[PDB]
Paper text:
Compound 2 bound in a similar binding mode to the previously reported CSNK2 inhibitors of the pyrazolo[1,5-a]pyrimidine scaffold. The N1 of the pyrazolo[1,5-a]pyrimidine core and the exocyclic NH at the 7-position of the pyrazolo[1,5-a]pyrimidine of compound 2 interacted with the hinge region of the kinase, forming hydrogen bonds with the hinge residue Val116. The nitrile at the 3-position of the pyrazolo[1,5-a]pyrimidine similarly formed a hydrogen bond with a water molecule buried in the ATP-binding pocket. This water molecule also formed a hydrogen bond with the carbonyl group of the amide. As far as we know, this was also the first time a crystal structure of an inhibitor of this series with a 3-aminopiperidine at the para-position of the aniline ring was reported. While acyclic amines at this position point towards the C-terminal lobe to interact with Asn161, here, the amino group on the piperidine was instead directed towards the N-terminal lobe, forming a hydrogen bond with Ser51 on the P-loop. Compared to the co-crystal structure of the CSNK2 chemical probe SGC-CK2-1 with CSNK2A1, the sterically demanding piperidine ring of compound 2 induces a slight leftward shift of the aniline ring towards the solvent, but the overall alignment between these two structures is excellent. We thus introduced a fluorine atom at the ortho-position of the aniline ring (compound 2). This modification retained the low nanomolar potency of compound 1 against both CSNK2A1 and CSNK2A2 as measured using the NanoBRET assay, as well as the submicromolar antiviral potency against the β-coronaviruses mouse hepatitis virus (MHV) and SARS-CoV-2.
Numbering used by the authors: 3 to 333
């Protein structure tokens, strides 16, 4: 079979907790009053939810309501517990309340409102410093949630809300997040395609927090190279090909070998043979002001096939790329 794997850090954190911390199916839900919230306007939809701006009529606070479509109650309980567990943590969205929508008898999660700048307009004006700053802020959230035994599993631009005016960032959408347990085999059908770690694409199920760091790598790549998304595959197979054409097939094959991964026979024809490319080839006059030796060192150490060898969020936070950010935060 496949070779087992444990997280390098925060390995046993959930084991040393009370059962109720991670055994979310046990979580009883205390419903708030649905009439405290009046829907203003629709903000977006998804396969499994519809998102609205609403006003909390009690205190006139703006709020964001995620009316869930029919999903497994298990997964509702799971998102709620994770949000409750993470409440107050750095750059983590606050779950303000939970109500039973009248026009669907469905659960609706009520969230803090972030006055978010649109990721099209923002990822164009971002200076080198801004990218470093906001990457540092994201890492605070990833390290915190990972230290609390949870993996987001859907890190990507659209799940990061940024109020540029107030230099304030919230990692949102915890609906795919899960508790890390050593030895557990997780679903690979998570995350969005351009952000899927190799482990997902080759069906290595015994993955961990390091998954989030791959996704962060993908984000960083696109920000510094001004290519959204950076690995732009047509499907899960081609996605791994896109990666392979950059990271090379040599390390991919070493990776499948190390963990004795059974590789879908599909892949055997389309992966081919590819050198690992030097990041300089993605550098052009238009983007160079964002690319630096530091940025490339940091990126290289996020984007690794072998999940065990990627930076941990805390290691990432210690990288030279953030030195000016860290000094400025202490002043
Ligand atoms: C809570 C909503 C969720 O988890 N995801 C989601 C959020 C938004 N919009 C915003 C927009 C703002 N502020 C801007 C108006 C000024 N804020 N502030 C806070 C929060 C939160 N949380 C949020 N969310 C969206 F437009 C689509 C989705 N999606 C799209 C992908 C699928 C997903 N559910 C599975 C729903």
């Amino acid at each position: 079979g496949p070779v087992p794997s444990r997280a390098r850090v925060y390995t046993d954190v959930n084991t040393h907790r009370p059962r109720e911390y991670w055994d979310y199916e046990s979580h009883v839900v205390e419903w708030g009053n649905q009439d405290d919230y009046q829907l203003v306007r629709k903000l977006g939809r998804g396969k499994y939810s519809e998102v609205f701006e609403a006003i909390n009529i009690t205190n006139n606070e703006k709020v964001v309501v995620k009316i869930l479509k029919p999903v497994k109650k298990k997964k509702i309980k799971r998102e709620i517990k994770i949000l409750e567990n993470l409440r107050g943590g750095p750059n983590i969205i606050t779950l303000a309340d939970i109500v039973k929508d009248p026009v669907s008898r469905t659960p609706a999660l009520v969230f803090e409102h972030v006055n978010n700048t649109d990721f099209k307009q923002l990822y164009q004006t971002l200076t080198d410093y801004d990218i470093r700053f906001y990457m540092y802020e994201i890492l605070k959230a990833l390290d915190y949630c990972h230290s609390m035994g949870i993996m987001h599993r859907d890190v990507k631009p659209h799940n990061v809300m940024i109020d540029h005016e107030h230099r304030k960032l919230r990692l949102i959408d915890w609906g795919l997040a899960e508790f890390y347990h050593p030895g557990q085999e997780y679903n690979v059908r998570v995350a969005s395609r351009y952000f899927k770690g190799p482990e997902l694409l080759v069906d290595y199920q015994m993955y961990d927090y390091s998954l989030d760091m791959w996704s962060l790598g993908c984000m960083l790549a696109s920000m510094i190279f001004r290519k959204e998304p950076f690995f732009h595959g047509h499907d899960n197979y081609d996605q791994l090909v896109r990666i392979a054409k950059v990271l090379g097939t040599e390390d991919l094959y070493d990776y499948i070998d190390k963990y004795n991964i059974e590789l879908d026979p599909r892949f055997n024809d389309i992966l081919g043979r590819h050198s690992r490319k030097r990041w300089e080839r993605f550098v052009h006059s238009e983007n160079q002001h964002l690319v630096s030796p530091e940025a490339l060192d940091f990126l290289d150490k996020l984007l690794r096939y072998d999940h065990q060898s990627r930076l941990t969020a805390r290691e990432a936070m210690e990288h030279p790329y953030f030195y000016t950010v860290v000094k400025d935060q202490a002043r």
